[PDB]
PDB file of C-alpha atoms in Angstrom:
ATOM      1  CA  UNK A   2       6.340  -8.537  13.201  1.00  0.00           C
ATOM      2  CA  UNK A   3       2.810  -7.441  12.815  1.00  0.00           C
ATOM      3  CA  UNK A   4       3.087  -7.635   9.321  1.00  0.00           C
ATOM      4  CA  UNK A   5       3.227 -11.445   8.836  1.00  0.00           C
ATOM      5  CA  UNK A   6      -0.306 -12.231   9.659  1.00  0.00           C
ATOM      6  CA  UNK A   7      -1.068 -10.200   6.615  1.00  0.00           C
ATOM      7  CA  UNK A   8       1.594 -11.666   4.476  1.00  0.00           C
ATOM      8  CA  UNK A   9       2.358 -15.224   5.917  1.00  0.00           C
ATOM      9  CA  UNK A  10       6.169 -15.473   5.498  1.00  0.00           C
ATOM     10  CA  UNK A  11       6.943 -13.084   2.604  1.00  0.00           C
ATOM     11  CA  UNK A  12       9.781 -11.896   3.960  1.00  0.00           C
ATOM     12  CA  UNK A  13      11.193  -9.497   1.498  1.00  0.00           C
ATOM     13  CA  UNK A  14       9.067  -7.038  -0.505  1.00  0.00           C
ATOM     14  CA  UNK A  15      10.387  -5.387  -4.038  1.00  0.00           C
ATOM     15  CA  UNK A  16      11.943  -1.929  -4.143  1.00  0.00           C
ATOM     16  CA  UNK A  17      12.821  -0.428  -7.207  1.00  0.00           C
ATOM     17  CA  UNK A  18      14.841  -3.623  -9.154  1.00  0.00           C
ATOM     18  CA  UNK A  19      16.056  -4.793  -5.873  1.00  0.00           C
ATOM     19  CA  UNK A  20      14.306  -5.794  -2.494  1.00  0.00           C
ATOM     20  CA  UNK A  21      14.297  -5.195   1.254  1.00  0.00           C
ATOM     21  CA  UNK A  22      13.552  -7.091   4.048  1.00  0.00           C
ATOM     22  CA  UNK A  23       9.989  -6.974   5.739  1.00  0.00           C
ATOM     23  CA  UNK A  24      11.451  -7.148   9.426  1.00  0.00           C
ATOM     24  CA  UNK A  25      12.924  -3.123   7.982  1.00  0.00           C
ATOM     25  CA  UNK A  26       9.467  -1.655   8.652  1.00  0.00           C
ATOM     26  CA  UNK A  27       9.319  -2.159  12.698  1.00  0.00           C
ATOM     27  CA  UNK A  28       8.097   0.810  13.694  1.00  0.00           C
ATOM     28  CA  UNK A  29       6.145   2.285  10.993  1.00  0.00           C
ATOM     29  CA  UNK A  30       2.732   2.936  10.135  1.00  0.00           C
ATOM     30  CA  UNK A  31       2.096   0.390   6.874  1.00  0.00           C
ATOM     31  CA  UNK A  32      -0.454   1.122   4.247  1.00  0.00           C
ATOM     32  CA  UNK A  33      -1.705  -1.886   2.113  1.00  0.00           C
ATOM     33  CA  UNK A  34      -2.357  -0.290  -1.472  1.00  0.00           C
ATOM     34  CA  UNK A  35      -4.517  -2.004  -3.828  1.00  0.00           C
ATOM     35  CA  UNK A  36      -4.464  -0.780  -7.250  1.00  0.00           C
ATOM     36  CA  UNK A  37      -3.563  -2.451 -10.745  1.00  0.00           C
ATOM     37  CA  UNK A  38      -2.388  -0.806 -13.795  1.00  0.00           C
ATOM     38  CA  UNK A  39      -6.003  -1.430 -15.627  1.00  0.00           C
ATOM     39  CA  UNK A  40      -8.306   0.142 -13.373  1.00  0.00           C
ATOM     40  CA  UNK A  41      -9.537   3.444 -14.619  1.00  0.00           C
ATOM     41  CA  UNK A  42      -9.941   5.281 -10.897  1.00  0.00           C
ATOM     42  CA  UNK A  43      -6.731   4.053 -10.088  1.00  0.00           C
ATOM     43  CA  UNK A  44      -4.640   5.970 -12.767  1.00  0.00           C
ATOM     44  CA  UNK A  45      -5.057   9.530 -11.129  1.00  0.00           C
ATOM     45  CA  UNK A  46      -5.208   8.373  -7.854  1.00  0.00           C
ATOM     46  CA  UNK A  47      -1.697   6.762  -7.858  1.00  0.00           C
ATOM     47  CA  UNK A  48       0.590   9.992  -8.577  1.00  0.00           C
ATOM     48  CA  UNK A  49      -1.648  12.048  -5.530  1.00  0.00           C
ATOM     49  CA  UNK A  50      -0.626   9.022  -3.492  1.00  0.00           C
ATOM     50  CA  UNK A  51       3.160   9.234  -4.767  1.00  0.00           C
ATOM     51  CA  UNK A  52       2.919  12.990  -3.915  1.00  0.00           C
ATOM     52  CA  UNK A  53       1.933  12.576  -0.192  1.00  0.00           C
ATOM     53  CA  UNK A  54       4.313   9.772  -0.396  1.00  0.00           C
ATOM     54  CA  UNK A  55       7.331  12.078  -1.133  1.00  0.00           C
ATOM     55  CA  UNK A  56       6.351  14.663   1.078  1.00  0.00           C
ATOM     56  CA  UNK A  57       5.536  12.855   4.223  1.00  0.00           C
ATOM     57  CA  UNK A  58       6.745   9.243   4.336  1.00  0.00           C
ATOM     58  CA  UNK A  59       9.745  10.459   6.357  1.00  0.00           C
ATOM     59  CA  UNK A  60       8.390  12.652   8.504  1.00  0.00           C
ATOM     60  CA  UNK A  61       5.281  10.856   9.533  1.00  0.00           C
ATOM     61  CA  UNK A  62       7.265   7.607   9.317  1.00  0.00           C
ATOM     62  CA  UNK A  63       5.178   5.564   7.186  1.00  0.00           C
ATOM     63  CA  UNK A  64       5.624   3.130   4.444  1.00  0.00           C
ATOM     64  CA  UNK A  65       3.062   1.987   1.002  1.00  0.00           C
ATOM     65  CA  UNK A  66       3.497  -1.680   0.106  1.00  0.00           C
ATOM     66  CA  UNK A  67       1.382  -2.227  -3.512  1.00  0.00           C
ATOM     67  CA  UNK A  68      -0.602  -5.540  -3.251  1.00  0.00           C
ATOM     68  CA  UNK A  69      -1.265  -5.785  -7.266  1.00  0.00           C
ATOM     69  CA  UNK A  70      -4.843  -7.020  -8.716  1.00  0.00           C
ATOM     70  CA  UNK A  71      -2.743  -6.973 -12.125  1.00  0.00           C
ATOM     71  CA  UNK A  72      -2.786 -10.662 -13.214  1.00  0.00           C
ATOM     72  CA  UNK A  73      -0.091  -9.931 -16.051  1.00  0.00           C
ATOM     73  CA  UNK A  74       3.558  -9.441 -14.499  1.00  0.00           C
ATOM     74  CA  UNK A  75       4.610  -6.900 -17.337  1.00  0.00           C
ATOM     75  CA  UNK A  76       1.538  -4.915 -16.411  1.00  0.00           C
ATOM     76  CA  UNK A  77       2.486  -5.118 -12.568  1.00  0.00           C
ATOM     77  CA  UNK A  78       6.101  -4.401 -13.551  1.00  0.00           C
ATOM     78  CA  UNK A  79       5.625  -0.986 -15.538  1.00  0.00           C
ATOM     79  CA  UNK A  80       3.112   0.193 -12.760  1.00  0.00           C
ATOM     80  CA  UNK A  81       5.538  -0.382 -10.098  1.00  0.00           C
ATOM     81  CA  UNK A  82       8.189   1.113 -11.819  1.00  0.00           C
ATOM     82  CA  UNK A  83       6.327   4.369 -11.573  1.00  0.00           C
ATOM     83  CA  UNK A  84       5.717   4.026  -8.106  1.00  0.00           C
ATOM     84  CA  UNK A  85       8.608   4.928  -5.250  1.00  0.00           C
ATOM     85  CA  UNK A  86       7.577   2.551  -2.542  1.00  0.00           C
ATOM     86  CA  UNK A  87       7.259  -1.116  -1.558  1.00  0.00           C
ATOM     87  CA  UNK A  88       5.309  -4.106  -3.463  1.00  0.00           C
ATOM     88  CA  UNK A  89       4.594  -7.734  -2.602  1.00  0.00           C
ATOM     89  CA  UNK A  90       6.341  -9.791  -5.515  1.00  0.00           C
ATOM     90  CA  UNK A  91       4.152 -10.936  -8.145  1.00  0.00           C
ATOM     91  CA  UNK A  92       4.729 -14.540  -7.411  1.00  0.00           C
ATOM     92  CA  UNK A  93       3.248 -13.851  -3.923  1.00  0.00           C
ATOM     93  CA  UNK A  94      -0.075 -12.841  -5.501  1.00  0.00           C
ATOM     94  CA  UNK A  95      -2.187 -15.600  -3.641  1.00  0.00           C
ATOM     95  CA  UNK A  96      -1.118 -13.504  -0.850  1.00  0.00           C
ATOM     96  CA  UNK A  97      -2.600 -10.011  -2.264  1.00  0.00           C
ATOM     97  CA  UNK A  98      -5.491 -12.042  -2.905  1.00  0.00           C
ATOM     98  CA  UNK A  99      -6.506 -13.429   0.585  1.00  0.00           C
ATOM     99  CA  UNK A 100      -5.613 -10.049   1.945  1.00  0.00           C
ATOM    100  CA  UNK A 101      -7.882  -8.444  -0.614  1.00  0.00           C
ATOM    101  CA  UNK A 102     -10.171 -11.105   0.883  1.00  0.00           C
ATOM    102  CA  UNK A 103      -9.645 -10.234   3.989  1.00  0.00           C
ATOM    103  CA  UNK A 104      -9.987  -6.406   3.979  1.00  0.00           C
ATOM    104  CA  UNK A 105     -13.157  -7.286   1.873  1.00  0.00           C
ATOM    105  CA  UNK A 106     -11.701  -4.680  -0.515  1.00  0.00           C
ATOM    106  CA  UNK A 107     -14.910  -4.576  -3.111  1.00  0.00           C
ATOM    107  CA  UNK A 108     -13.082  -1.778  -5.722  1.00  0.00           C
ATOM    108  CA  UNK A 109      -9.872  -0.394  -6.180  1.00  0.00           C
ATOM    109  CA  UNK A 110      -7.781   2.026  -5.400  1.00  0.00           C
ATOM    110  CA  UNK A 111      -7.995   1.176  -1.449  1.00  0.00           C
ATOM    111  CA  UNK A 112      -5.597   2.212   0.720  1.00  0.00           C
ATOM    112  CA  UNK A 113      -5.348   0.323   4.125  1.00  0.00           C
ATOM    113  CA  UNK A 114      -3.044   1.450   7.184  1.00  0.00           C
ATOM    114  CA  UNK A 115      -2.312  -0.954   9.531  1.00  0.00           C
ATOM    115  CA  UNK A 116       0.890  -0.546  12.622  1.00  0.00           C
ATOM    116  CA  UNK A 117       3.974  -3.211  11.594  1.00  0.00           C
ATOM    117  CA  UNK A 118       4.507  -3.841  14.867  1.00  0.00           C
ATOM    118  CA  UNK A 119       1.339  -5.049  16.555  1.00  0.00           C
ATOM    119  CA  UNK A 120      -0.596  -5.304  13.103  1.00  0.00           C
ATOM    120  CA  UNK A 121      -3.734  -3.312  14.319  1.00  0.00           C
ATOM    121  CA  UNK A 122      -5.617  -1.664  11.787  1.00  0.00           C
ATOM    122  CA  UNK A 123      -5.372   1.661  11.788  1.00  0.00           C
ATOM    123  CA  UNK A 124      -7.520   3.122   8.711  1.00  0.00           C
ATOM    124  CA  UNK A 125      -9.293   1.799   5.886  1.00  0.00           C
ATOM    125  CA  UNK A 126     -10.544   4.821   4.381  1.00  0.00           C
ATOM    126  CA  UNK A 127      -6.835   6.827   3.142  1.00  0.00           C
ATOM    127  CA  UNK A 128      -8.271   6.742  -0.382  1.00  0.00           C
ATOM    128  CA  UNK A 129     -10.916   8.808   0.012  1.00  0.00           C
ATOM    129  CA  UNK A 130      -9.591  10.880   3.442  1.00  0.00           C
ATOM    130  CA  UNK A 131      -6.324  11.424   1.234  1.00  0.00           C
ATOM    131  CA  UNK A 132      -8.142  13.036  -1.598  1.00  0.00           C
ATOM    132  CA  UNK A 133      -9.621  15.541   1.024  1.00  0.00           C
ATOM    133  CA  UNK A 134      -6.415  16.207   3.101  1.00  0.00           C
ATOM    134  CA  UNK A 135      -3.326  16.317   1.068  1.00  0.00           C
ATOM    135  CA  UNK A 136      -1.666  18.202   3.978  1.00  0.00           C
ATOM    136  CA  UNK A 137      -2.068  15.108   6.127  1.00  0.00           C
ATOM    137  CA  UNK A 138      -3.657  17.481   9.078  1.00  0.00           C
ATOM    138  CA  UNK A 139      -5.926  14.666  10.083  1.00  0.00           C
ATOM    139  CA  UNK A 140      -3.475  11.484   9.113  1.00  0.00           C
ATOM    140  CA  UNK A 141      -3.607   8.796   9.676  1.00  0.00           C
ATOM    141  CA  UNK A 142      -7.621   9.390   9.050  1.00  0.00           C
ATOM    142  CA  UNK A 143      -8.042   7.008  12.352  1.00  0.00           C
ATOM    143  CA  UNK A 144     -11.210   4.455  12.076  1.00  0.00           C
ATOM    144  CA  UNK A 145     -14.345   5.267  14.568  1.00  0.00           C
TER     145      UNK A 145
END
């Protein structure tokens, strides 16, 4: 439910070629990842994200939703494909925008953790803390 303030009624998000509800991630720890399939510092950053992804999404019951800065759909659609998690459509992109706005994301890759259910922010710093702790020992690399 904490979700919709950042996504104002989307209430599915892609997976894979299908789609799942948003209402599916009660519970979880959320992180907002904006990236786009141009951006040079994005391109090894993604797969280190997919690998913590694999090994921990589970087990420290967490979830990656993509909010794309690619403005061409094939472009967003090959990216995603490589990716296991979530992703705001493409037609929602106004959305990704404001909340790019909002997070005052100045560069990408950013990777922003916020709680579905009461939508406090949790981190916006997993990009870099990620890169240092693969393990996870310090997740979810809490804000002062």
């Amino acid at each position: 439910s904490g979700l919709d303030k950042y996504l104002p009624g989307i209430e599915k998000l892609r997976r894979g070629d299908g789609e799942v509800e948003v209402k599916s991630l009660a519970g979880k720890l959320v992180f907002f990842y904006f990236s786009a399939s141009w951006c040079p510092p994005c391109r090894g950053f993604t797969p280190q994200l997919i690998e913590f992804y694999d090994k921990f999404h589970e087990s420290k019951n967490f979830e990656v939703v993509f909010c794309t800065w690619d403005e061409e759909e094939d472009g967003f659609a090959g990216y995603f494909a490589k990716m296991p998690w979530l992703a705001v459509p493409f037609a929602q992109s106004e959305a990704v925008q404001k909340l790019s706005k909002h997070f005052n994301v100045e560069s990408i890759p950013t990777l922003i953790g916020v709680d579905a259910d009461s939508g406090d922010v949790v981190t916006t710093r997993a990009r870099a803390t990620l890169v240092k702790d693969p393990e996870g020992e310090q997740f979810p690399w809490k804000d002062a």
